[PDB]
Nucleic acid binder design. Structure first.
Ligand code: MG
Ligand code: ZN
Ligand code: ZN
Ligand code: ZN
Ligand code: ZN
Lengths: 1131, 115, 404, 67, 46, 51, 206
RNA sequence: AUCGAGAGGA
């Protein structure tokens, strides 16, 4: 029955495999989008108010149902056809499906003359579709079906195709809503502040933040204030309580202080009462609120109405926005004050801003919902204006012409295309970085980009606290994978078994709590709240309970049985403070864990047995979760959980550590993400090395996707001979690194050989490189289109001619065909022409606008595709193919942060060799190891020697006590090798033995995208910028290198004044001006007629020539634009 | 972009001499032999054969740059001898050694295939 | 040309070079001139500027050329020195038991540019002629400079007792009349510190002679290292069973000591020291115990090393690494700190959900009692990732403020 | 994508061994014994056969451009 | 002169002249590919 | 204070133990792109005509 | 029409070994041939023309490389070891090419390297101490060692020199191993002879 | 071509 330790390493990984058979790696994206389409769009459409318009006749126009068909495309003839994602990629279409809404317009004029007209399936917009979602044409297709459609079966999906560009929505971090968080700002007028970003269940407005603060000590005592929304002045809490109908001080403290035996709380609230005694009735308090507001009505009536509306709608919407909710709002605001007092009295800890239990991940669904709310509101507005301008004339109108569908369509398309998350007009208030271009450089880069999280703290911020690896990231975020540049700690990555909750309605839970012995908050007396336990659901205090323990037992039983409580519902019992917080909302990152009985796992051997035959008896992960054996625990419920790292922790020990565990890790290696799960032996490296590899696995070459032959990507690198690593971890089985690997096993020798590998460099074998070692192919796609925008000027693909075309370069166009397009198989060098495009003029009647190769490439045309774009003019894509043979300067890396460029390449006779004539493919310098402490590199090399000599794949899973260095060495000594991986090598040049026995063996190396040929650049009098006549910027522009301020300072320190003048004047922008010797302002010179005159001074004899930079002339002219007179006085 | 053709390691450029002899002025009876389009394969054997001559006081070689395709062999001999004569005799001795080794390897192969 | 690397921090980040046209498509640099640029070959790119007049060319040739840039005015010492392979190899080369044969010596003399063509009389004539590495470095050393240094492993109690001028360990570098009379050369003798051989060469001999000195050390030593070889592998990370037992006993004793301090604090048997609160005093005691454990285990690992250990070779020469790195690879990685304190209670009174609440023990708060060869446990792995994230954040955040 | 022709290290031909290697593996050989049957004794050639991923078999799941 | 293209879906060799919408005559598919040139490109097997 | 300049080049750096400290190894393509305006004299008339 | 681009196929064809035993000495380098681009005196013509019409995958192997010269053929195609795989083809895919094979050696490209490993060793017992084992007991014995198992390495020989070099020359297939050794000795001897000829011209010109 | 944004390199 029990899984014994000897079977555990199989059982756990069997369980893990079942998880990845059920979910995958992009499950969060697909589930978010599916919830958005199934629920969020319908909720948004129904939550909009019916637009009642009347001059008389009236019309309501109620939207009642939505229909999202499959993705289709409409040609110029208008025939709807099912559009495949690959066709969208090739034709630069948007993989979107039409959204139709049912509309009901009832005519009501008078005399009960009512009649309803329903417009079924009114086309309301087009919604882009996430690939492999339920509403994707690739849904449920087999691998054969996907290959029939020219799709990769290993492609995870989880992205959109907007204008042929694959866009991926990055999950955005945000502070959780409807939760009270008591912080303390050191530099502020308030000692403690308790904030609550409140938002109603079905979002319709932004988060309304309410603060309840305490004024810092230094009138008599510490005063509690409340910064309500839409009010620009602090308001005493007692005033707010009275404005809600609680005038008696006893009632207010009944709502705030639940234990009247506690004078400390009492004296700390007393200043607030003493400050609010002149105001003692609800109307006066409402008048005070309205007066403190930023729109103080001259008459107290409208002041009181405004205060009523604010306190009913903007104050704590999550508690309830309807009327008669003042009791719930009073109880909740009293809870906020109670929490603030507990913090000020030291009875509760301040809340941690960085705790991921306090955060939420805004995924594709809830982000598209924000867009859709804004866009549907704008659409209903436009419909209101259109219908109003017609009914004002007293006649009917056609809603089909009122609905301008471009709002929703173009809005979603623009937002996903650019990443600016918001309305196109508010292009600066909008937050960019959402919806990035999917990284297709290697399969690991694609997976990681699809599992990418973002902390929008702002890269400019230099506070390290949000960048720090918090304790609560354990199991939810990769500890290693993070960019090492300016976004350290802000851009994160999901751990492998991390699941972001999609969201759920609290209705069944609330109903069960009602049927259960919970007492509502309006029905109780406050005297009961002392000993009772509060119950919050999605931040709303809904009631109280008397035995929280057996309530938690009941709820956990219900969730483990897949009863009314779904698996993703978090249920935290804080014991010391008697809250029970239940969460069903979306964005809660959680992970699966094995539940533990008294001191035993519930995962018995029968579950492993049924999981082994997963493909026959359809016993899956969901059956494991439904059995009550596995549980999803979120960051906030982990605080109440006692984990076992392994079932070995559940053994009874000579001194028991815990003996009351509640859960167990499925495997600790699941704390790593996609790119860190490729590192072998990451627990033997320094952690920065693991981070650098997690970044560098994403630039590694491989086969980024199986269907690369049909993709017209702008840039693509494919390795000739990708190999799976000889030394692998058990997590790559689910990353599909074995099916799409990104490196080669290289016989690497760590040695000092000729000095060409010093300081992070490598010596490669020229003979190996000749045999296809780390050879790659680079595919570059050029796009072009001939626009017939108007009869004024039209472009067209056609072989240009020297007699008709004007802007025709001296490059030869013979490689083009009569259609103007080069043919595949044609070898093209730099500056060559691949598309001959000519544009009609207003060298006559047509000008050359041909597409050249990006300079200095020298490839062969791989293929040419011709089609029609969305509007329907001819559209061409040409993929050119360039074989990249590794060379000096190309960057290579192992899986341990050990990067370096090729210093030199030696032939096989020049490389050092073992007694059996094995030469290293790569030689790396021993000095790269000691400071870096990448012992995982050495253990991987030794394990790889054992694996190659044994005919197996080494197990480098991080935390594995069945694999240590002594075992690997003992294994290697059985194959006739030195147990530590050393060998006697001979000098290739002289054949003499090397005195020091070299450490050599197979290690998995990666070829990175950074090849020297894509970086080398030179300039000598090339093109210049228009504004300031200085060299351009970039290799692509043939630009010059920037001689910056620091270079100026260095050369000033050198004392090299002529070199400094050459760099900053003569090699950048030499220029001449003519200055009036009297006024010092630039004069008018006419060198052809030799007439120089200053219009200002009315002189034409006292002019002087001045040699100045063009940028300085431009500066002085831009100062004269500002009415400044910079007078260059030559005397 | 900058890859030299692989034959440039073996083939002489037009007007480029296979070997150049330059008198070393630091010490007497020393010469520098700059041999183009050769590498350690001939340099090592020529040096080691020259070291077998008791009339050779110095015999060394270097590949000044691996990316370049020449070697320099410095030979100093006793005053009654010459570095050019030493170099010639070293090549003659290497040729005779290789001829003998080839004939003996042919004989050994014949014995092995026959019995 | 002026050769530059960004960020251009000081005047040595832009130096004058003479162009040498070579086949492939990278900028090829000498390895001594990498420290001034702060340049390594992990994909770094550098900028070449070509002066376009005889006046600017003369300016760069007389002011900014690299040999004129050997000594920096910032700290009146060399800015470039001997570096990784050449430094490990010159340390191995100038050991007392390095004996070169006639053919090896001629091979090395082929790579001396400043050689008068005279083979020196070997240090050993019989039974077989053998030159020493010091005897060839004496040929590399220019002019008639005089220098006294001490190898990094020089015992401090040797200059007092006998054998001061005849060192048993071949420490106490002594160069006289441009001959390495004795001593093992290392970072202290050929690095960028003040009073080293490269500095004294630049001060006594010109910048040209010092340029040749750098080049000759590099060429001769690299071509000898082709014979000697240098490596590193698992065998250098391993220690004997006695050392492992000593380290584990040290760690066990340290954890029991921390348990005793915890028990004292729990029983109110701990009184605070002046200038600190009780929490801070407990933290000081625990951190002192664990730092003592780390240092003792590191000393155990260091003494366990053989003379053939390649970690010890690179640390001794000063080429790369430190004794703390050896301790972390062999003995114990040690305490992980976030903001100068142990791992914070990021959960509620816990560092991770795997620990009990209010657990101030060493493993709970981020003491990695394993080495990198042993491998970190999952909690040690996460805490080490936290500590390393602190360094990454520091490196990425200090740059803007320091540049401003 | 396809089995290399030569071993990158030594230059031994491995191109003619992939199909035989697979046939030995379905014959219930261990990977080590299979590599021994094909005569791959240096761990470089064993690396070549043992770490190869036959991606061409997946690229042949797509219909060609011309019928 | 003919500029025969191949269909991305039906793989049909069909001729299309300039100023003609890009449509396969056999199945109407909108994506077409050019055929391999007849020019003589040489590879050094290296 | 800082600006783009002509007669500049940039590429990856690489070790070369066989250069002196004051030498820089330059590709032939960078050197073929970059030029130095040398004045003609009877001292260099023949060499510059050759070039 | 195969899934491997043209340079992939070309590179792959270059690495197929061709029987070179008696023909390599007769053929000339195209540098030395007085013909045009090609001729039968400096080159060998190969043709390959395969089309997958059937439903199973067609293995285009080295057996499909048809030569004009019967003496120079792919080694695997010589009259066991299977044929080298050039490319796998799917129904409707087709590969038709025309190759020319030339004379060269491994300095120019590893495809002209005839060896599949050259094991070279000397002093199997570390008597010259050209290696220095920190722990000589830990190292396995060479196959050419003559030491009793208690003895880890031979006693140091101060008067010793490297003699008795052991070789294991493995052939890729193009040449026989003994032909590789004989051709190596002849090539080294002709390198030295040419060097001596040029030396004599330099000495007499001075 | 410009501008902006994003992703990256040292
Ligand atoms: Mg660098
Ligand atoms: Zn004037
Ligand atoms: Zn091999
Ligand atoms: Zn068609
Ligand atoms: Zn010919």
């Amino acid at each position: 029955d029990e899984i014994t330790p000897d079977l555990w390493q199989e059982a756990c990984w069997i369980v893990i495999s079942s998880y990845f058979d059920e979910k995958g790696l992009v499950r969060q994206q697909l589930d978010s989008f599916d919830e958005f389409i199934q629920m969020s769009v319908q909720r948004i459409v129904e939550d909009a108010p019916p637009i009642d318009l009347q001059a008389p006749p009236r019309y309501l126009l109620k939207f009642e149902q939505i229909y999202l068909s499959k993705p289709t495309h409409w040609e110029r003839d208008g025939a709807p056809s099912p559009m495949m994602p690959n066709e969208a990629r090739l034709r630069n279409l948007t993989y979107s499906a039409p959204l139709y809404v049912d509309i009901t317009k009832t005519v009501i004029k008078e005399g009960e003359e009512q009649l309803q007209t329903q417009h079924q399936k009114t086309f309301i917009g087009k919604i882009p579709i996430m690939l492999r979602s339920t509403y994707c044409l690739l849904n449920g297709l087999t691998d054969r079906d996907l290959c029939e459609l020219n799709e990769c079966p290993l492609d995870p999906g989880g992205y959109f195709i907007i204008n042929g560009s694959e866009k991926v929505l990055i999950a955005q971090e945000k502070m959780a809503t409807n939760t009270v968080y008591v912080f303390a700002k050191k530099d502020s007028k308030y000692a403690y502040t308790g904030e609550c970003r409140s938002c109603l269940e079905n979002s319709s407005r932004p988060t309304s933040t309410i603060w309840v603060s305490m004024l810092a000590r230094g009138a008599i005592g510490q005063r509690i204030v409340a910064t309500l929304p839409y009010i620009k002045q602090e308001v005493p809490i007692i005033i707010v309580f009275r404005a809600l109908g609680f005038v008696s001080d006893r009632d207010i403290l009944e709502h705030i202080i639940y234990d009247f035996e506690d004078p400390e709380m009492m004296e700390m609230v007393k200043p607030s009462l003493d400050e609010a005694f002149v105001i003692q009735e609800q109307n006066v308090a409402l008048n005070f609120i309205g007066s403190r507001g930023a729109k103080p009505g001259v008459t107290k009536e409208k002041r009181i109405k405004y205060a009523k509306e604010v306190l009913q709608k903007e104050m704590l919407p999550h508690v309830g926005v309807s009327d008669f909710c003042e009791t719930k709002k009073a109880y909740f605001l009293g809870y906020m004050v109670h929490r603030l007092l507990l913090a000020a009295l030291g009875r509760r800890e301040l809340d941690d801003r960085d705790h991921y239990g306090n955060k939420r991940l805004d995924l594709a669904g809830p982000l598209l919902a924000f867009l859709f709310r804004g866009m549907f509101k704008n659409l209903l507005k436009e419909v209101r204006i259109y219908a109003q301008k017609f009914i004002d004339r007293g006649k009917d109108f056609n809603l089909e012409l009122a609905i301008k569908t471009r709002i929703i369509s173009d809005g979603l398309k623009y937002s996903l295309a650019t990443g600016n998350w918001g309305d196109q007009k508010k292009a600066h208030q909008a937050r960019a970085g959402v919806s990035q271009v999917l990284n297709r450089l290697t399969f690991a880069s694609t997976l990681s980009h699809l599992r990418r999280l973002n902390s929008p703290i702002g890269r400019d911020g230099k506070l390290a606290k949000p960048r720090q690896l918090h304790n609560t990231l354990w199991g939810m975020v990769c500890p290693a994978e993070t960019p090492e540049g300016h976004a350290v700690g802000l851009v994160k990555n999901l751990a492998l078994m991390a699941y972001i909750s999609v969201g759920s309605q609290p209705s069944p839970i609330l109903e069960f709590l009602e049927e259960w012995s919970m007492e509502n908050l309006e029905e109780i007396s406050p005297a009961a709240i002392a000993d009772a336990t509060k119950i919050f659901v999605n931040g709303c205090w809904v009631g109280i309970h008397k035995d929280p323990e057996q309530l938690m037992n009941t709820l956990r039983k219900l969730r483990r049985q897949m009863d009314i409580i779904v698996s993703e519902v978090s249920m935290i019992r804080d014991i010391r403070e008697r809250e029970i917080r239940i969460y069903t909302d979306a964005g809660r990152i959680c992970r699966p864990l094995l539940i533990v009985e008294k001191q035993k796992l519930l995962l018995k051997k029968r579950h492993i047995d049924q999981l082994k035959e997963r493909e026959y008896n359809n016993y899956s992960w969901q059956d494991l979760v439904a059995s009550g054996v596995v549980e999803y625990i979120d960051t906030l419920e982990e605080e109440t959980v006692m984990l076992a790292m392994t079932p070995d922790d559940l053994q009874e020990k000579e001194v028991a550590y815990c003996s009351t565990y509640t859960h167990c890790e499925i495997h600790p290696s699941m704390i790593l993400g996609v790119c860190a799960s490729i590192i072998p032996f990451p627990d033997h490296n320094q952690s920065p090395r693991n981070t650098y590899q997690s970044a560098m696995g994403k630039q590694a070459m491989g086969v980024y996707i199986t269907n690369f032959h049909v993709r017209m990507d702008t840039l693509a690198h494919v390795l000739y001979y990708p190999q799976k690593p000889l030394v692998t971890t058990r997590s790559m089985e689910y990353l599909r690194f074995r099916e799409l690997p990104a490196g080669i096993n290289s016989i690497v020798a760590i040695a000092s050989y000729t000095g060409y590998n010093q300081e992070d460099s490598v010596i490669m074998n020229r003979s190996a490189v000749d045999r296809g070692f780390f050879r790659s192919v680079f595919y570059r796609s050029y796009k072009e289109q001939e626009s017939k925008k108007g009869f004024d000027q039209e472009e067209v693909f056609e072989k240009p001619t020297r007699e008709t075309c004007q802007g025709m370069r001296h490059a030869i166009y013979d490689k083009l065909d009569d259609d103007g397009l080069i043919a595949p198989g044609v070898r093209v060098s730099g500056d060559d022409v691949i598309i001959g495009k000519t544009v009609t003029l207003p060298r006559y009647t047509k000008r050359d606008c041909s597409t050249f190769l990006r300079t200095s490439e020298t490839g062969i045309v791989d293929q040419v595709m011709v089609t029609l774009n969305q509007e329907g003019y001819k559209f061409c894509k040409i993929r050119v193919r360039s074989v990249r043979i590794p060379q000096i300067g190309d960057k290579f890396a192992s899986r341990h942060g050990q990067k370096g460029t090729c210093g030199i390449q030696y032939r096989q006779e020049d490389m050092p060799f073992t007694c059996e004539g094995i030469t290293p493919d790569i030689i790396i310098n021993p000095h790269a190891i000691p400071s870096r402490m990448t012992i995982g590199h050495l253990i991987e090399c030794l394990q790889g020697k054992v694996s190659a000599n044994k005919g197996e794949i080494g197990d480098a899973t991080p935390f594995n006590d069945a694999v240590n260095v002594q075992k690997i060495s003992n294994l290697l000594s059985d194959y006739g090798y030195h147990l530590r991986g050393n060998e006697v090598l001979y000098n290739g040049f002289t054949g003499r033995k090397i005195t020091s026995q070299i450490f050599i063996g197979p290690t998995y190396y990666q070829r990175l995208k950074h090849m020297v040929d894509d970086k080398i650049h030179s300039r000598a009098r090339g093109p210049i910028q228009i504004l300031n006549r200085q060299p351009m910027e970039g290799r692509s522009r043939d630009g010059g290198l920037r001689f910056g301020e620091m270079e100026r300072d260095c050369q000033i320190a050198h004392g090299a004044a002529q070199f400094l003048r050459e760099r900053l004047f003569e090699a950048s922008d030499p220029y001449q001006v003519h200055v009036c010797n009297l006024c010092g302002i630039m004069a008018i010179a006419n060198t052809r007629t030799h007439t120089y005159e200053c219009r200002g001074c009315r002189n034409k004899t006292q002019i002087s020539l001045v040699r100045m930079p063009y940028a300085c002339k431009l500066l002085f002219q831009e100062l004269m634009s500002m009415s400044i007179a910079p007078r260059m006085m030559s005397v | 972009m900058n890859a030299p053709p692989a034959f440039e390691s073996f083939l002489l450029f037009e007007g480029e001499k296979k070997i150049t002899i330059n008198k070393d002025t630091k010490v007497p009876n020393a010469c520098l032999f700059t041999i183009n389009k050769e590498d350690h394969t001939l340099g090592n054997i020529i040096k080691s054969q020259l070291l077998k001559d008791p009339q050779v006081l110095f015999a060394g070689y270097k590949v000044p740059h691996p990316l370049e395709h020449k070697i320099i062999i410095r030979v100093q001999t006793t005053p009654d001898y010459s570095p050019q004569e030493a170099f010639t005799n070293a090549i003659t001795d290497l040729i005779s050694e290789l001829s003998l080794l080839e004939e003996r390897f042919r004989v050994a192969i014949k014995d092995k295939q026959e019995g | 040309v002026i050769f530059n690397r960004q960020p251009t921090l000081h005047k040595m980040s832009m130096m004058g070079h003479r162009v040498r046209i070579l086949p492939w498509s990278t900028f090829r640099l000498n390895l001594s001139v990498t420290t001034p640029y702060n340049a390594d070959f992990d994909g770094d790119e550098m900028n070449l500027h070509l002066p376009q007049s005889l006046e600017t060319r003369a300016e760069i040739q007389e002011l900014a050329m690299v040999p004129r840039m050997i000594v920096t005015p910032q700290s009146n010492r060399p800015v470039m020195g001997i570096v990784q392979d050449t430094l490990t190899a010159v340390r191995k080369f100038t050991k007392r038991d390095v004996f070169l044969e006639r053919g090896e010596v001629m091979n090395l003399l082929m790579f001396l540019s400043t050689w008068d063509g005279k083979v020196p009389q070997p240090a050993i004539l019989k039974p077989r002629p053998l030159w020493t590495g010091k005897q060839i470095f004496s040929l590399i050393i220019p002019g008639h400079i005089n220098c006294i240094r001490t190898h990094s492993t020089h015992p401090d109690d040797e200059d007092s007792g006998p054998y001061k001028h005849i060192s048993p360990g071949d420490t106490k570098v002594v160069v006289e009349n441009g001959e390495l009379i004795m001593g093992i050369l290392c970072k202290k003798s050929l690095g960028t510190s003040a009073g080293s051989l490269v500095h004294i060469s630049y001060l006594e001999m010109g910048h040209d002679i010092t340029r040749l000195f750098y080049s000759n050390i590099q060429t001769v030593i690299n071509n000898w290292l082709l014979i000697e070889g240098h490596t590193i592998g698992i065998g250098d990370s391993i220690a004997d069973s006695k050392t492992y037992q000593d380290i584990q006993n040290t760690i066990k004793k340290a954890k029991q000591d921390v348990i005793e301090v915890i028990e004292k604090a729990h029983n109110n048997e701990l009184e605070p020291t002046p200038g600190n609160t009780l929490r801070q005093t407990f933290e000081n005691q625990v951190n002192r115990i664990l730092n003592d454990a780390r240092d003792k285990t590191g000393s155990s690992a260091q003494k366990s090393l053989s003379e053939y250990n390649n970690f010890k070779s690179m640390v001794v020469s000063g080429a790369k690494g430190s004794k703390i790195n050896i301790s972390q690879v062999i003995a114990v990685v040690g305490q992980q700190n976030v903001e100068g304190k142990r791992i914070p209670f990021g959960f509620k009174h816990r560092t991770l959900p795997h620990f009990i609440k209010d657990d101030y023990g060493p493993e709970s708060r981020g003491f990695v009692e394993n080495s990198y060869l042993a491998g970190l446990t999952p909690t040690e792995f996460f805490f080490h990732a936290m500590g390393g994230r602190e360094g990454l954040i520091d490196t990425a955040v200090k740059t803007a403020e320091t540049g401003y | 994508m396809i089995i290399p022709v030569r071993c990158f290290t030594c230059g031994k031909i491995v191109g003619n061994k992939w199909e035989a290697y697979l046939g030995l593996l379905q014959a219930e050989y261990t990977e080590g014994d299979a590599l021994d049957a094909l005569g791959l004794k240096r761990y470089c050639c064993r690396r070549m056969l043992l770490a190869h991923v036959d991606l061409i078999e997946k690229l042949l799941n797509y219909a060609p451009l011309e019928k | 002169q003919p500029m025969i293209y191949i269909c991305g879906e039906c793989h049909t060799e069909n001729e299309i002249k300039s100023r003609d919408p890009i449509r396969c005559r056999e199945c109407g598919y909108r994506i077409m590919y050019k055929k391999r040139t007849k020019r003589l490109v040489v590879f050094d097997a290296r | 204070m800082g600006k783009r300049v002509d007669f500049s080049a940039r590429t990856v750096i690489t070790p070369d133990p066989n250069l002196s400290i004051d030498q820089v190894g330059v590709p032939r393509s960078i050197a073929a792109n970059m030029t130095f305006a040398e004045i003609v004299t009877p001292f260099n008339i023949d060499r510059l005509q050759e070039l | 029409s195969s899934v491997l681009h043209d340079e992939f196929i070309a590179h792959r064809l270059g690495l197929i070994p061709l029987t070179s035993d008696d023909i390599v000495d007769k053929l000339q380098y195209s540098r030395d041939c007085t013909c045009e681009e090609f001729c039968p005196e400096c080159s060998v013509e190969f043709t390959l023309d395969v089309r997958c019409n059937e439903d199973q995958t067609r293995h285009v192997t080295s057996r499909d490389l048809i030569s004009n010269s019967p003496r120079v053929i792919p080694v695997t195609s010589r009259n066991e070891q299977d044929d080298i795989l050039i490319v796998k083809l799917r129904k409707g895919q087709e590969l038709r090419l025309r190759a020319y094979a030339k004379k060269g050696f491994g300095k120019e490209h590893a495809k002209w390297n005839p060896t599949a490993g050259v094991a070279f060793e000397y002093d199997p017992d570390n008597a010259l101490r050209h290696t220095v084992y920190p722990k000589p007991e830990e190292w396995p014995k060479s196959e050419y060692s003559e030491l009793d198992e208690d003895e880890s390495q031979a006693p140091y020989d101060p008067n010793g020199k490297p003699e008795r070099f052991y070789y294991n020359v493995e052939s890729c297939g193009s040449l026989r191993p003994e032909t590789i050794v004989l051709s190596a000795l002849s090539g080294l001897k002709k390198k030295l002879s040419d060097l001596q000829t040029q030396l004599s011209h330099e000495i007499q010109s001075d």
